[PDB]
């Protein structure tokens, strides 16, 4: 980028980091907006290599796409009313491959 | 151990009573007197 | 000496101060990662049998390796919840008598009386014997506090300073600086942060907010800048050491990538085993995400020049009147808006 675009991006970034800081305790009262930026977080990382034979899938057969690690309190807040359950069981590979 | 509870006051309560019973006196103070207030448990029960 | 007399008596000498104070907060994070985020290799276990008090100790060990097999970024962490604040937002006068090395005053009696009057009015004081060949640790604390004592450093600045500067995310140096401003050459990190023939970058109509803490060898720089190492012997952390110290540079990577590299959890620079927010103890490894450290900014909290306007007339929101006559109320702009109730 040229200078001007970088400066504008920088100011926007500073504003964003000042705002989006404690998002789980500030906007605790809006379940819909919570799901609105979780989807932003998921769709902001690039994928990785697609080499595999057997992968982590649900009972239907759909392949999973990632893991989202939390603290127990956070997991419960997300499960209560924000995110919607897809399945309660999973298919997990049972061998390393040496 | 060590520390403390409270309710809401006014001493010249010639900062106390005009017509409400709810949320009324909160800016700390009116002329030269002492207008204590409010931070132990129960907010808004039992109207006056 | 006359400053001692006036500042005690209640007089207001023709200067003004800006305070800076560093705080910690415990936060619960939120991590996401894609499928093939790490290519992970496992070795084969091997055992060392090591003699013990009466018997033997078997130490099973196993080597392993990890690789990033992702072209882009495969993991994003975001600080999520505000748990407990860790340290105290107290009113803390930093004591500058912990430092030895400056040119001493001629009359040792005057220096002794100054140290007595400076350790006066304050908490953290060189212990009374004044040990030679020592770290000059403060009189060791008894039971501990409510939060780690967060030292507040003062910087001189002219009285008639534009108050509007502090109502937003400002910079204590008075002239915004940092690496984030580049584009044409490599030796501009010095021109931005010290050259005063060029306008300030942020407030692009003036050289610097205060000329007493922005030039190459002014008072503020001569006292806090880390390259001169004036407070080397003082174990007290200086919360404004990160604003006055020129950061090391490698221009090989472009600005955005370098920003991301600095954005991760940098190592701690304060104390979690010593109680006055001392300098970072050797061997201490705590990983702390550090905003307002990579942007060189400080957030102004809810403060008012007066106990007056701080609080208003509805039993709820606090006072909101900005300036009345010569007092002022700096409305909160820190990320702690909907937290830390009143």
């Amino acid at each position: 980028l040229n200078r001007v675009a970088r400066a504008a991006l920088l100011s926007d970034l500073k504003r964003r980091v000042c705002a989006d800081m404690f998002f789980m305790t500030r906007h605790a009262r809006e379940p819909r907006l919570i799901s609105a930026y979780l989807s932003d977080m998921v769709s902001c990382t690039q994928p990785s290599v697609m080499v595999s034979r057997i992968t982590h899938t649900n009972t239907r057969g759909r392949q999973v796409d990632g893991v989202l690690v939390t603290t127990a309190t956070l997991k419960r807040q997300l499960l209560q009313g924000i995110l919607q359950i897809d399945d309660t069981a999973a298919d997990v590979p049972v061998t390393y491959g040496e | 151990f060590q520390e403390a509870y409270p309710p809401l006051c006014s001493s010249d309560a010639a900062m106390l009573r005009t017509a409400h019973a709810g949320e009324t006196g909160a800016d700390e103070v009116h002329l030269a007197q002492y207008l204590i207030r409010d931070a132990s448990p129960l907010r808004g029960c039992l109207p006056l | 000496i006359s400053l001692t007399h006036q500042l005690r008596t209640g007089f207001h000498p023709g200067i003004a101060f800006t305070v800076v104070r560093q705080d910690r907060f415990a936060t619960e994070q939120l991590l996401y990662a894609e499928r093939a985020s790490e290519s992970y290799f496992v070795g084969q276990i091997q055992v060392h049998h090591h003699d013990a008090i009466g018997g033997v100790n078997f130490t099973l060990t196993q080597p392993r390796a990890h690789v990033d097999l992702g072209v882009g970024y495969t993991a994003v962490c975001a600080t999520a919840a505000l748990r407990c604040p860790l340290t105290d937002m107290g009113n803390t006068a930093q004591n500058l008598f912990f430092s030895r090395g400056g040119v001493p005053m001629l009359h040792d009696n005057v220096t002794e009386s100054l140290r007595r009057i400076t350790a006066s009015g304050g908490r953290l004081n060189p212990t009374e014997p004044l040990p030679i060949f020592g770290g000059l640790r403060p009189a060791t604390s008894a039971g501990i506090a409510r939060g780690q004592a967060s030292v507040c450093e003062f910087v001189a600045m002219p009285v008639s300073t534009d108050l509007q500067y502090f109502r937003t995310a400002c910079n204590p140096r008075g002239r915004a600086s940092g690496m984030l401003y580049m584009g044409d050459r490599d030796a501009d990190i010095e021109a931005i942060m010290f050259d005063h023939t060029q306008s300030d970058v942020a407030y692009t109509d003036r050289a610097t907010l205060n000329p007493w803490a922005s030039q190459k060898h002014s008072y503020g720089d001569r006292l806090y800048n880390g390259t001169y190492n004036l407070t080397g012997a003082s174990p007290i952390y200086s919360p404004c050491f990160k604003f006055f110290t020129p950061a090391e540079v490698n221009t090989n990577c472009n600005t955005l990538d370098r920003l991301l590299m600095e954005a991760k959890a940098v190592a701690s620079q304060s104390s979690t085993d010593t109680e006055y927010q001392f300098k970072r103890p050797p061997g201490s490894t705590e990983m702390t995400q550090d905003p307002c450290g990579l942007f060189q900014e400080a957030y102004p909290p809810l403060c008012s020049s007066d106990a007056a306007m701080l609080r208003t007339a509805h039993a709820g929101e606090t006072g909101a009147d900005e300036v009345h006559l010569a007092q002022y109320l700096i409305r909160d702009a820190s990320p702690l808006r909907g937290c830390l109730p009143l």
Binding site: - | - | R146, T197, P301
Partner: protein, 146 residues
């Protein structure tokens, strides 16, 4: 990191405005909102105002570091300096005359001692003009006590 100004005094007279007749007044004869502030009051870790005042800065300002100008002089001496008149920075000695001949001689010399305008007379500058980079005296204002 939080930042707060303490002794800042709003110099401009239009900025010392009150939002109604007395939107901060008294019963005393002198409304002392006109006196410059001397303290700053901030909510603690705890919902607690506490007090930071000028006097707390004495741990930082009353140290001997306020008179450590030697390094500053050494650094300043290593830049490009132009020959400037020495009217306001030179002190002579008497020549045991009648104090009238001395004044006449000084006037004659002073007819052309200064080829320009001294920098220390331009005190009419307002703060905005003083701060601006074009001010040549700006780089010579480093310590508050020098």
């Amino acid at each position: 990191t939080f930042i707060m100004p303490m002794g800042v005094f709003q110099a401009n007279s239009m900025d010392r405005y009150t939002r109604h007749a007395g939107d901060f007044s008294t019963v005393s004869e002198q409304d002392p909102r006109q006196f410059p502030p001397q303290g700053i009051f901030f909510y603690n870790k705890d919902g607690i105002l506490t007090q930071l005042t000028l006097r707390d800065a004495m741990g930082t300002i009353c140290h001997s570091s306020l008179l450590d100008v030697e390094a500053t002089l050494v650094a300043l001496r290593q830049q490009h300096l132009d020959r400037q008149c020495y009217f306001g920075v030179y002190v002579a000695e008497g020549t045991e005359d009648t104090l009238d001949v001395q004044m006449g001689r000084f006037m004659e010399t002073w007819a052309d001692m200064m080829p320009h305008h001294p920098h220390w007379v331009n005190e009419h500058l307002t703060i905005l003009q003083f701060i601006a980079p074009s001010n040549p005296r700006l780089r010579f204002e480093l310590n508050p006590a020098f």
